[PDB]
Amino acid sequence: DTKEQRILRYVQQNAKPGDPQSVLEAIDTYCTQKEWAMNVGDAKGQIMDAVIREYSPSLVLELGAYCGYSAVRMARLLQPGARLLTMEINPDCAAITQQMLNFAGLQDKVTILNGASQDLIPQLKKKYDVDTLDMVFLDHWKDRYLPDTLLLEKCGLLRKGTVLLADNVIVPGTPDFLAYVRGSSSFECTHYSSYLEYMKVVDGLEKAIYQGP
Numbered sequence: 050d051t052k053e054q055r056i057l058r059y060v061q062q063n064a065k066p067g068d069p070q071s072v073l074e075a076i077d078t079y080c081t082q083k084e085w086a087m088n089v090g091d092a093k094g095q096i097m098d099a100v101i102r103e104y105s106p107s108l109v110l111e112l113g114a115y116c117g118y119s120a121v122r123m124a125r126l127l128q129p130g131a132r133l134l135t136m137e138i139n140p141d142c143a144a145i146t147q148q149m150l151n152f153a154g155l156q157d158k159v160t161i162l163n164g165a166s167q168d169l170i171p172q173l174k175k176k177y178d179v180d181t182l183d184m185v186f187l188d189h190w191k192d193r194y195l196p197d198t199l200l201l202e203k204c205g206l207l208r209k210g211t212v213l214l215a216d217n218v219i220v221p222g223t224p225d226f227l228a229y230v231r232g233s234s235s236f237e238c239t240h241y242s243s244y245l246e247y248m249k250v251v252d253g254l255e256k257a258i259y260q261g262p
């Protein structure tokens with residue numbers, strides 16, 4: 050089996066069904082003590098929590114679900130009736146994410162789509178009945194942050210106030226995306242310095258609020 054399968058099994062055997070916080074704790078324990086994995090982690094995850102609570106978004110889009118850690122993290126703080134859509138290109142990881150959400154009891158709040166963000170984004174309006182997004186969490190391939198931001202705008206999915214929150218802007222790094230949003234009058238940016246998940250290595254989140262054209 051794979052690392053991701055081991056993580057899922059660990060959660061199933063060390064967390065409480067229907068208890069998202071126990072799921073996050075289980076994943077953090079496994080990744081600290083057993084095998085590292087690219088979940089956003091507790092350090093950055095606390096910042097994410099603070100952002101989600103500030104904005105109380107009704108519709109969030111996540112790019113790059115992996116095992117569902119961040120989807121659990123965000124969805125557990127959404128208000129009743131609010132929704133998360135998350136995309137994952139790797140079919141094995143999409144199935145793990147689905148099962149992780151099911152175990153957490155969040156499956157009614159979250160739709161996990163198996164596919165590439167650049168193919169699925171242009172379908173959101175006609176196929177998934179999306180008007181505009183309140184928040185976007187970018188955590189997929191780092192060289193796709195910029196192209197998919199531009200794609201989101203082209204598709205009419207951003208509104209005044211939409212919050213983009215980007216993981217890994219320092220490690221592995223997303224230098225084109227950071228230069229772009231920081232230099233654009235269409236975004237208001239804030240940098241939240243933190244640490245790479247499960248590691249004593251500096252990383253950060255960037256928040257970029259869309260201001261319109």
Ligand SMILES: C[C@H](C[C@H]1O[C@@H](n2cnc3c(N)ncnc32)[C@H](O)[C@@H]1O)NC(=O)c1cc(-c2ccc(F)cc2)cc(O)c1O
Nearest residue numbers: 087113115136137138139142165166188189190217220221
């Ligand atoms: C990119 C991955 C996260 C997931 O993104 C999905 N994905 C891809 N492209 C697409 C698409 N176009 N559409 C949808 N899903 C998509 C994929 O299949 C992964 O499951 N994340 C990382 O590689 C990542 C790596 C590190 C990292 C840091 C220090 C190191 F020494 C080594 C690795 C830390 C992090 O925090 C990460 O987030």
Ligand SMILES: [Cl-]
Nearest residue numbers: 088089118119
């Ligand atoms: Cl994650």
Ligand SMILES: [Cl-]
Nearest residue numbers: 090091092247
């Ligand atoms: Cl951490």
Ligand SMILES: [Mg+2]
Nearest residue numbers: 089188216217
């Ligand atoms: Mg990441």
